[PDB]
Amino acid sequence: DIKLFGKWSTDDVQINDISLQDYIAVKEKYAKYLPHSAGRYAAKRFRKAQCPIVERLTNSMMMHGRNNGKKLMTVRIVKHAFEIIHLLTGENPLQVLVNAIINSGPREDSTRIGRAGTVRRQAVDVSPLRRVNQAIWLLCTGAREAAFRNIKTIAECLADELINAAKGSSNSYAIKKKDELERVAKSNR
Amino acid sequence: TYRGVDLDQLLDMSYEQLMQLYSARQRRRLNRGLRRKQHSLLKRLRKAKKEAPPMEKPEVVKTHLRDMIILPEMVGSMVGVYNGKTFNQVEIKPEMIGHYLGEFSITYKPVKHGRPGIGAT
Amino acid sequence: GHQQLYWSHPRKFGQGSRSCRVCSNRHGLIRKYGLNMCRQCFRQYAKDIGFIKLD
Amino acid sequence: GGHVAQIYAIRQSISKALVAYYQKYVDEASKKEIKDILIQYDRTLLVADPRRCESKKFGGPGARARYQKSYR
Amino acid sequence: PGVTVKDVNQQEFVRALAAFLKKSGKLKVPEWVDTVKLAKHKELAPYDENWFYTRAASTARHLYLRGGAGVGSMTKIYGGRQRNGVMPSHFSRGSKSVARRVLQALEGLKMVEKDQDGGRKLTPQGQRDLDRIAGQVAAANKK
Amino acid sequence: MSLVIPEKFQHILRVLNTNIDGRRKIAFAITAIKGVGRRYAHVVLRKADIDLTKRAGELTEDEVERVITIMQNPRQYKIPDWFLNRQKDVKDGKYSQVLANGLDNKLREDLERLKKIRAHRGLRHFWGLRVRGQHTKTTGRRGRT
Amino acid sequence: RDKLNNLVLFDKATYDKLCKEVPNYKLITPAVVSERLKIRGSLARAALQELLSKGLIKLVSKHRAQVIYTRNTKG
Amino acid sequence: MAVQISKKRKFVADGIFKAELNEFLTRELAEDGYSGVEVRVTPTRTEIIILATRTQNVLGEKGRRIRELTAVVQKRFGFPEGSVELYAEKVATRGLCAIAQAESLRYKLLGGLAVRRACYGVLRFIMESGAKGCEVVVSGKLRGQRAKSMKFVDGLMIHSGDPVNYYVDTA
Amino acid sequence: AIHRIRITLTSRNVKSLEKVCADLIRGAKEKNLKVKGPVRMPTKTLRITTRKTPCGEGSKTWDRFQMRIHKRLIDLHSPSEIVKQITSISIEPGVEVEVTIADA
RNA sequence: CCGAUAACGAACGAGACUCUGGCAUGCUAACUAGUUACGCGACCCCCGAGCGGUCGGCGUCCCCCAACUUCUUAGAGGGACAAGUGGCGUUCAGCCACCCGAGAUUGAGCAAUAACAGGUCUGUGAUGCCCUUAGAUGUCCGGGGCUGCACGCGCGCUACACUGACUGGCUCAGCGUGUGCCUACCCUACGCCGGCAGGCGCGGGUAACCCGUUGAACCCCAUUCGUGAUGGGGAUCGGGGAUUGCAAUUAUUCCCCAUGAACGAGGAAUUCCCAGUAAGUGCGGGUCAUAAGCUUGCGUUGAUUAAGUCCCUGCCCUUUGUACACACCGCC
Ligand SMILES: [Mg+2]
Ligand SMILES: [Mg+2]
Numbered sequence A: 001d002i003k004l005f006g007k008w009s010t011d012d013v014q015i016n017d018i019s020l021q022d023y024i025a026v027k028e029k030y031a032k033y034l035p036h037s038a039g040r041y042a043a044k045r046f047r048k049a050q051c052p053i054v055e056r057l058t059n060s061m062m063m064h065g066r067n068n069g070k071k072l073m074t075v076r077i078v079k080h081a082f083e084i085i086h087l088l089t090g091e092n093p094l095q096v097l098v099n100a101i102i103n104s105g106p107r108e109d110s111t112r113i114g115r116a117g118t119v120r121r122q123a124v125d126v127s128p129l130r131r132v133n134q135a136i137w138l139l140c141t142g143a144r145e146a147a148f149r150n151i152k153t154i155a156e157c158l159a160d161e162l163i164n165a166a167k168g169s170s171n172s173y174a175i176k177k178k179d180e181l182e183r184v185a186k187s188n189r
Numbered sequence B: 001t002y003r004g005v006d007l008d009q010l011l012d013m014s015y016e017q018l019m020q021l022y023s024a025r026q027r028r029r030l031n032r033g034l035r036r037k038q039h040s041l042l043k044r045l046r047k048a049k050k051e052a053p054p055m056e057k058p059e060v061v062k063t064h065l066r067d068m069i070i071l072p073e074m075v076g077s078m079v080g081v082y083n084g085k086t087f088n089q090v091e092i093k094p095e096m097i098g099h100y101l102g103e104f105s106i107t108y109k110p111v112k113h114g115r116p117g118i119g120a121t
Numbered sequence C: 001g002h003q004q005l006y007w008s009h010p011r012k013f014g015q016g017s018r019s020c021r022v023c024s025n026r027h028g029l030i031r032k033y034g035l036n037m038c039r040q041c042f043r044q045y046a047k048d049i050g051f052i053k054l055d
Numbered sequence D: 001g002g003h004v005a006q007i008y009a010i011r012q013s014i015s016k017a018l019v020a021y022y023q024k025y026v027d028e029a030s031k032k033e034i035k036d037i038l039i040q041y042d043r044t045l046l047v048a049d050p051r052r053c054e055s056k057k058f059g060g061p062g063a064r065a066r067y068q069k070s071y072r
Numbered sequence E: 001p002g003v004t005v006k007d008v009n010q011q012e013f014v015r016a017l018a019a020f021l022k023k024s025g026k027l028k029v030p031e032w033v034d035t036v037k038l039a040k041h042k043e044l045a046p047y048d049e050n051w052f053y054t055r056a057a058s059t060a061r062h063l064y065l066r067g068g069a070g071v072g073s074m075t076k077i078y079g080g081r082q083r084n085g086v087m088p089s090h091f092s093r094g095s096k097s098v099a100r101r102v103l104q105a106l107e108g109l110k111m112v113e114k115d116q117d118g119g120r121k122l123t124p125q126g127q128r129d130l131d132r133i134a135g136q137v138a139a140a141n142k143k
Numbered sequence F: 001m002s003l004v005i006p007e008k009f010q011h012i013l014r015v016l017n018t019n020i021d022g023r024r025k026i027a028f029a030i031t032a033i034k035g036v037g038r039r040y041a042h043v044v045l046r047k048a049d050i051d052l053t054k055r056a057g058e059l060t061e062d063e064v065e066r067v068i069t070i071m072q073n074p075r076q077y078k079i080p081d082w083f084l085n086r087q088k089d090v091k092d093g094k095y096s097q098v099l100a101n102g103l104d105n106k107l108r109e110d111l112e113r114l115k116k117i118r119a120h121r122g123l124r125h126f127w128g129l130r131v132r133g134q135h136t137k138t139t140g141r142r143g144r145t
Numbered sequence G: 001r002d003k004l005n006n007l008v009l010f011d012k013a014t015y016d017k018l019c020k021e022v023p024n025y026k027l028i029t030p031a032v033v034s035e036r037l038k039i040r041g042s043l044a045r046a047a048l049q050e051l052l053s054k055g056l057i058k059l060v061s062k063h064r065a066q067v068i069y070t071r072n073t074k075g
Numbered sequence H: 001m002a003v004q005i006s007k008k009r010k011f012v013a014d015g016i017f018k019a020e021l022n023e024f025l026t027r028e029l030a031e032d033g034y035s036g037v038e039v040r041v042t043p044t045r046t047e048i049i050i051l052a053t054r055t056q057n058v059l060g061e062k063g064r065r066i067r068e069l070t071a072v073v074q075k076r077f078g079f080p081e082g083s084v085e086l087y088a089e090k091v092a093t094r095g096l097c098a099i100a101q102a103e104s105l106r107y108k109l110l111g112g113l114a115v116r117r118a119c120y121g122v123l124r125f126i127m128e129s130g131a132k133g134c135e136v137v138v139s140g141k142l143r144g145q146r147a148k149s150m151k152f153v154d155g156l157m158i159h160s161g162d163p164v165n166y167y168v169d170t171a
Numbered sequence I: 001a002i003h004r005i006r007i008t009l010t011s012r013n014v015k016s017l018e019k020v021c022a023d024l025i026r027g028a029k030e031k032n033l034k035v036k037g038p039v040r041m042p043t044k045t046l047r048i049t050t051r052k053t054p055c056g057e058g059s060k061t062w063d064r065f066q067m068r069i070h071k072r073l074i075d076l077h078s079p080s081e082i083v084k085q086i087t088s089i090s091i092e093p094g095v096e097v098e099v100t101i102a103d104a
Numbered sequence J: 001c002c003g004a005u006a007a008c009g010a011a012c013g014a015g016a017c018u019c020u021g022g023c024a025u026g027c028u029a030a031c032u033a034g035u036u037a038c039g040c041g042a043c044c045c046c047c048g049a050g051c052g053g054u055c056g057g058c059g060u061c062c063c064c065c066a067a068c069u070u071c072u073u074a075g076a077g078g079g080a081c082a083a084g085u086g087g088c089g090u091u092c093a094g095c096c097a098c099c100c101g102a103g104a105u106u107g108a109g110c111a112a113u114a115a116c117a118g119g120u121c122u123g124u125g126a127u128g129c130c131c132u133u134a135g136a137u138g139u140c141c142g143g144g145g146c147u148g149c150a151c152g153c154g155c156g157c158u159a160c161a162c163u164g165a166c167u168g169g170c171u172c173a174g175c176g177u178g179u180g181c182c183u184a185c186c187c188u189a190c191g192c193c194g195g196c197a198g199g200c201g202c203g204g205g206u207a208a209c210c211c212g213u214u215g216a217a218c219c220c221c222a223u224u225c226g227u228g229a230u231g232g233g234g235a236u237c238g239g240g241g242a243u244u245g246c247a248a249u250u251a252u253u254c255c256c257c258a259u260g261a262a263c264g265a266g267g268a269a270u271u272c273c274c275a276g277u278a279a280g281u282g283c284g285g286g287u288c289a290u291a292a293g294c295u296u297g298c299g300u301u302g303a304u305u306a307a308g309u310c311c312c313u314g315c316c317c318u319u320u321g322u323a324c325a326c327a328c329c330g331c332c
Helices: A053-061 A071-089 A093-104 A128-146 A154-167 A173-187 B007-011 B015-021 B024-031 B036-051 C039-049 D004-024 D028-039 E010-023 E051-065 E071-077 E096-108 E124-142 F026-032 F038-046 F061-072 F102-116 F120-127 G012-024 G030-037 G042-054 H007-028 H064-077 H098-111 H115-130 I015-030
Strands: A108-110 A123-125 B061-063 B079-082 B087-090 E080-082 E090-092 E112-114 E120-122 F012-015 F018-021 G057-059 G069-071 H034-041 H046-052 H084-090 H133-140 H148-155 I003-011 I044-051 I062-078 I096-101
Touching (some): A053 A093, A123 A173, A128 A173, B015 B024, B036 B061, E051 E071, E071 E096, E096 E112, F018 F026, H007 H034, H007 H064, H098 H115, H115 H148
Parallel strands (some): B061 B079, H046 H084
């Protein structure tokens, strides 16, 4: 019904794990025609949970100085990349995004202050919100330094980053970094 | 040869038709009014040049003003341009027309860097 | 000198054409709104002129 | 305003004008059973965002940032 | 179905206006079109050849939008961002003579007349021309 | 248009005494010639009646020699007087566009003329310093160290 | 990773290479055409619009900076 | 119109005129217990009102000195003749005027009185005139060459906020 | 008337302008001239920002100064004469008054 | 702040306060702001609509010759108080969530005692003492210099590119300024000339009347380019042309044509910052005869992260220890 970007119905998409379904906001209660809103989601803690993850990707994609107000260009980037992944895959782009967020969320990480054994003293499992945030951040970083100094434009880099993260192929920056984090955490158990 | 014309034609080349031959800044300079200081210097060089001995360069004349532009009617004079301390004599070659007098009396001596002192530790 | 060089040097514009209307200084003047006053003197008298502080 | 803020002003104005027309020239029943969808879809459609800007201060280039300081 | 120029996308509309102006060629094209830049801040000449027809079409569209716009007015619309090299960028206006010559060519086709006040506006038959082209490009984009 | 590579497509050319990349566009290939810039290339191509959207290597000899002839003496080809490089020469006062290593030797002889008349700008050129009055206290340390 | 020496103009072994398998896979962009056919990319755009005019490649996006094509449907 | 300047420059010139007049009367009426100046302006003419403790002193012999200063201000800012009037108003409760008490203290100290006793007497007089607080600071080369500052304060004295503007006078 | 006059009132404060704009119009109603409604022009705000230090040594504190200039326009229009009728000004110091005519 | 309580009674600071911003279809008013309606019109549809659509085109305070303040302006007023609910709490101070609300923490200004041998005698006809005072350390005039460069440092700007550059088209601001006592020096519409930098005539504005409806940039839409030190990058350097002035050289500044240098994202270290915020992005003022890479403000686009800690740097209170008291940059 809502049909973000004119198509790609939101109802069919299914969240496989109950670990992050309280933090992904692709459902019709949170489905919007267009990922842009002055939603004041930064005003309070945990308000980003109700924020749709499409908006989170759009906000997260515009980085690195040259892109701090260029939001509509990022929106057109998201629409084009959805077009591309629907063409390369055939399914709902939003389902690909959801699965990519699921598989790019690093399940545990290490942090402490004292003398590092390898990197940090302890290994700690993470909350779902940090999973979602870090997955999005990793995806945007992977697309950004995938498209930096090559003819392959930013849209295709975002597209294949999300496609590879939706499956898991070690060809995406996000899950490579996630696997490094998991190895570090297990070693620092 | 300044703009294809020879020196002798430049001698009888009056100001208004010469401003075309000068560059933009000199043309603006002649277009604006010449003051009594420039005219007095010109009269001094004319008097010295006419009283200059034959086949012999004229005597030197000094001046603080160095913003004087060089006219072809001053080619071969002895003029003393002040450097802030002394008056430096300078030849007027037939290629110096579009130049200021102060472009040839340097205001500083060049720098030969000695050993740096306590600074830049 | 005589009349022809004592004040012959032009000051029909520029910083030397202006002085503080109070302390006769030539630095930090405020020419906005024709004030022609030094900065420190403006601090001294801004209450008297009426420029007060709100924010 | 700009462009996108202009768009938001127009869409807000459309929503508010429609609900006012429905409140006055017809019953408040239609007014309320469109106001509900407008509310639980987008609160901003009917209520303006009070934030505008923030004053720049004399210690930094922007509203909150400060010029870079160095010690040596 | 009354169709004004305000009801069709102005970009292909002005492009079709430029195309009609090209094919109905009576313009006073100056001899220096091939050489000069379009502004101080522009760093290349416009890529397309008949850029003059496009610019005149745009001036016609603007005078349709609001009247009395002088040469300085048109350069204010046709201003642009002077990158100013290593110094921070600024805003720079359009070419005065280019706008003036476009205007003079506009009353060359008697579609533009001067106001009682300073500046110039469109004539009713020029308004008719614009409106007919708007309707026909509306028909083209619809059908 | 978008055909196979033409049979008479040399990858680089020889202009005057220099070589230009025929792989790139003609509007930007001849910019490789010193003294030739993008605007100069644009104007000579527009008044050369040559399609801009074709590379340099796919031209023929008549086209390129027309380009050369326009470049050598653009005065007769309606190129405006103020567009040129070497305007109002210091030796003969004749308006001329310079195209090649003539530029290099002309710059050299201008610098030595400035040195010979002992201009302040010329003396700065002799010492390798800035001539436009920029600050040398803090900047340009790379060129000496 | 030094240089890509992309082809500015088509040759015979690549012209037919473009002709015989390009409208077969799902994604068609100037980016992928240039990167898997080792051509410049302005050439890629020109070839893509030529194949569009020939009608054996279906357009979807046509954005000024990001144009995407698909093959025509089979069935 | 073209002769008359804009509103902004008008207000600026008014403020400058007021400040210059106040400063001149301060430098001139220092010993006469000068308290303040008030100017009432009409396009027909302006009225200047001077607040001072010693009105009988600021007015000269048969009004000689007031005539003198009227001529001074007449010729200085170039009013039309007879368009300015100088009224001297005797202040009420001179103990409350910070400027007048400051001038009386300065006169006392230049007289050679003990700074401690002079400060105590001035403070006592100010509080005896009736006030909710007072504060005086003396700073300079007291005793030896080294600078020292003695502050004598009693009663209530706020420092912050708007109300210090219209509750505390400063001299 | 037959006179149509324009009166402007301006000062630095708001209270004095308000009381003048009140008492003048009340006097006019008591003296049965119909009055054009009081028009408040946008407030002039002269902003001046200056370093607090007179030395330049310190933490770069800039002090800012504001002079709010408020001005009001009220027109007196009567079938009868005006200036011969109303002459009293009732003006306190600090507020500026200027009276013009329709032709002005 | 509640409370205990050899304290009682106070006082400043903080708070309070003023401005600022956010809602007021409630009041007042509006030809130096408008809205609505009507009438003239112009043009498209006129197949036929015709109370069809646009107009920043013109009129209805030109005085009898329409209404109104929603928009704009600025005054009076209102409005938010932890007010209600649920929970925690000695059930006191108060804290969290939630409803309704525009807003449930809008930012600034002001800002206590005591001080620092911190800065300014180059702001002063503020000033003690000392120096000089006619071959003047006074003052004037002319010129130079304050820019001068083997190098180091700081605040910045430009950038390293395809999320881009160029070319065109479309399209949206708010602060605030504008003709001078000396003091000459304004912001500018329109018309013409020139390609640009500018010039030549006619006006407007001492100002919500004019610039100006400030047609800003970024952004948006199409074009070319195509991963190269490339159409990035514009430093150096040449020629020429314009404005200010008495004077433009050691280039004032602007402009055209040439030159494309380092730079492929930056070590050891480190700055700032929690929402219209950082950042991008332009625009005003200050300095100005000429002017901004600076600064003060303004607006446009507009986020990620966090609702915690004393680990680093510190700050405040209590206890404690001292051989410190110029106070650990101590003493020895
Ligand atoms: Mg306070
Ligand atoms: Mg280029």
